[PDB]
PDB file of C-alpha atoms (C1' of nucleotides) in Angstrom:
ATOM      1  CA  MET A 293       0.000   0.000   0.000  1.00 27.29           C
ATOM      2  CA  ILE A 294       2.659   2.453   1.191  1.00 27.63           C
ATOM      3  CA  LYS A 295       6.187   1.306   0.386  1.00 26.36           C
ATOM      4  CA  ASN A 296       9.608   2.399   1.641  1.00 25.58           C
ATOM      5  CA  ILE A 297      12.429   1.909  -0.864  1.00 24.65           C
ATOM      6  CA  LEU A 298      16.174   2.265  -0.234  1.00 26.36           C
ATOM      7  CA  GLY A 299      18.248   2.319  -3.421  1.00 24.29           C
ATOM      8  CA  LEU A 300      22.011   2.057  -3.032  1.00 20.36           C
ATOM      9  CA  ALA A 301      24.658   2.479  -5.740  1.00 23.34           C
ATOM     10  CA  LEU A 302      28.075   1.344  -4.505  1.00 24.96           C
ATOM     11  CA  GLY A 303      30.947   2.536  -6.681  1.00 24.28           C
ATOM     12  CA  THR A 304      34.661   1.915  -6.378  1.00 24.37           C
ATOM     13  CA  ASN A 305      34.961   4.544  -3.634  1.00 24.37           C
ATOM     14  CA  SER A 306      31.534   6.237  -3.637  1.00 26.74           C
ATOM     15  CA  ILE A 307      28.179   5.353  -2.086  1.00 28.86           C
ATOM     16  CA  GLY A 308      24.945   6.856  -3.368  1.00 28.36           C
ATOM     17  CA  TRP A 309      21.846   6.430  -1.219  1.00 27.28           C
ATOM     18  CA  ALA A 310      18.221   7.260  -1.986  1.00 27.92           C
ATOM     19  CA  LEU A 311      15.286   6.708   0.372  1.00 31.17           C
ATOM     20  CA  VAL A 312      11.799   7.154  -1.084  1.00 31.36           C
ATOM     21  CA  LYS A 313       8.262   6.661   0.219  1.00 28.88           C
ATOM     22  CA  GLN A 314       5.988   5.704  -2.666  1.00 27.17           C
ATOM     23  CA  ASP A 315       2.496   4.405  -3.439  1.00 28.27           C
ATOM     24  CA  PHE A 316       2.516   2.414  -6.680  1.00 27.22           C
ATOM     25  CA  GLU A 317      -1.210   1.627  -6.832  1.00 31.02           C
ATOM     26  CA  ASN A 318      -2.212   5.311  -7.047  1.00 33.41           C
ATOM     27  CA  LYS A 319       0.850   6.513  -9.016  1.00 35.56           C
ATOM     28  CA  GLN A 320       1.593   8.722  -6.000  1.00 39.04           C
ATOM     29  CA  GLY A 321       5.009   9.217  -4.450  1.00 41.13           C
ATOM     30  CA  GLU A 322       7.408  11.673  -2.873  1.00 41.19           C
ATOM     31  CA  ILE A 323      11.169  11.452  -2.392  1.00 41.68           C
ATOM     32  CA  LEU A 324      12.339  11.234   1.212  1.00 46.26           C
ATOM     33  CA  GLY A 325      15.934  12.056   0.311  1.00 46.05           C
ATOM     34  CA  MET A 326      19.175  11.154  -1.406  1.00 46.35           C
ATOM     35  CA  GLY A 327      22.861  11.706  -0.816  1.00 41.52           C
ATOM     36  CA  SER A 328      26.386  10.797  -1.830  1.00 40.69           C
ATOM     37  CA  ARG A 329      29.244   9.701   0.430  1.00 39.21           C
ATOM     38  CA  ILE A 330      32.690   9.981  -1.163  1.00 37.94           C
ATOM     39  CA  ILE A 331      35.690   8.055   0.165  1.00 37.66           C
ATOM     40  CA  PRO A 332      38.664  10.023  -1.196  1.00 33.60           C
ATOM     41  CA  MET A 333      41.038   7.918  -3.283  1.00 33.97           C
ATOM     42  CA  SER A 334      43.390   9.541  -5.760  1.00 34.50           C
ATOM     43  CA  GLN A 335      43.247   8.586  -9.427  1.00 33.05           C
ATOM     44  CA  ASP A 336      46.365   6.425  -8.983  1.00 34.41           C
ATOM     45  CA  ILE A 337      44.532   3.848  -6.862  1.00 33.70           C
ATOM     46  CA  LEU A 338      41.586   3.906  -9.277  1.00 33.15           C
ATOM     47  CA  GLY A 339      43.920   3.178 -12.180  1.00 30.74           C
ATOM     48  CA  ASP A 340      45.890   0.603 -10.183  1.00 30.08           C
ATOM     49  CA  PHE A 341      43.280  -1.625  -8.528  1.00 31.77           C
TER      50      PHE A 341
ATOM     51  C1'  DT B 219      52.036   7.038 -11.031  1.00 29.17           C
ATOM     52  C1'  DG B 220      49.153  11.304 -10.625  1.00 29.25           C
ATOM     53  C1'  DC B 221      49.369  14.995  -7.926  1.00 29.26           C
ATOM     54  C1'  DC B 222      51.138  17.532  -3.620  1.00 31.33           C
ATOM     55  C1'  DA B 223      54.211  20.592  -1.827  1.00 33.84           C
ATOM     56  C1'  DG B 224      57.407  24.073  -2.868  1.00 31.15           C
ATOM     57  C1'  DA B 225      60.842  26.001  -5.931  1.00 30.34           C
ATOM     58  C1'  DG B 226      60.722  29.417  -9.533  1.00 30.11           C
ATOM     59  C1'  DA B 227      59.671  33.766 -12.398  1.00 31.63           C
ATOM     60  C1'  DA B 228      57.137  38.690 -13.056  1.00 35.38           C
ATOM     61  C1'  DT B 229      55.431  42.136 -10.908  1.00 34.54           C
ATOM     62  C1'  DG B 230      54.324  46.002  -7.708  1.00 33.42           C
ATOM     63  C1'  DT B 231      55.019  48.303  -3.098  1.00 33.15           C
ATOM     64  C1'  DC B 232      57.614  50.241   0.619  1.00 29.88           C
ATOM     65  C1'  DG B 233      61.477  51.415   4.258  1.00 29.42           C
ATOM     66  C1'  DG B 234      65.379  54.054   4.228  1.00 31.94           C
ATOM     67  C1'  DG B 235      69.201  56.562   3.853  1.00 36.03           C
ATOM     68  C1'  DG B 236      71.678  59.845   0.726  1.00 34.70           C
ATOM     69  C1'  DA B 237      70.793  64.062  -3.073  1.00 35.65           C
ATOM     70  C1'  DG B 238      69.187  68.018  -4.113  1.00 34.25           C
ATOM     71  C1'  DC B 239      66.119  71.920  -3.316  1.00 36.16           C
ATOM     72  C1'  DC B 240      64.616  75.470  -0.614  1.00 32.85           C
ATOM     73  C1'  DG B 241      62.082  78.509   3.118  1.00 33.18           C
ATOM     74  C1'  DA B 242      64.134  81.747   6.710  1.00 36.31           C
ATOM     75  C1'  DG B 243      66.573  84.923  10.292  1.00 34.91           C
ATOM     76  C1'  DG B 244      70.173  87.913   9.625  1.00 35.83           C
ATOM     77  C1'  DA B 245      74.375  90.650   7.848  1.00 34.57           C
ATOM     78  C1'  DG B 246      76.769  94.129   3.906  1.00 34.15           C
ATOM     79  C1'  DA B 247      74.948  98.031   1.166  1.00 32.34           C
ATOM     80  C1'  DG B 248      72.606 101.963   0.189  1.00 28.06           C
ATOM     81  C1'  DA B 249      68.709 105.793  -1.072  1.00 27.29           C
ATOM     82  C1'  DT B 250      66.971 108.716   1.862  1.00 26.24           C
ATOM     83  C1'  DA B 251      64.112 112.154   5.184  1.00 23.31           C
ATOM     84  C1'  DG B 252      65.031 114.101   9.937  1.00 21.57           C
ATOM     85  C1'  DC B 253      68.235 116.738  11.457  1.00 23.50           C
ATOM     86  C1'  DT B 254      71.832 120.649  11.528  1.00 22.80           C
TER      87       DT B 254
END
DNA sequence: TGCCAGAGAATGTCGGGGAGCCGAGGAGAGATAGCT
């Protein structure tokens, strides 16, 4: 009826989160929030791993 | 190994200590009106 969805995109050193409260049956929904957490690696580690 | 920290290169600004001007009280130098 009312659904809580937590979408996570986990990169090499980045984490994107999105929490949303939605109602699919009525095509009704609002976004609770989203954010990005960045773990700082230099480009050398990205090209080396 | 990409990128961080700092060397490196052009500027512009400012103390600072001599150079050179230059305002100012004061002394020769005299025309001169009060005096004889």
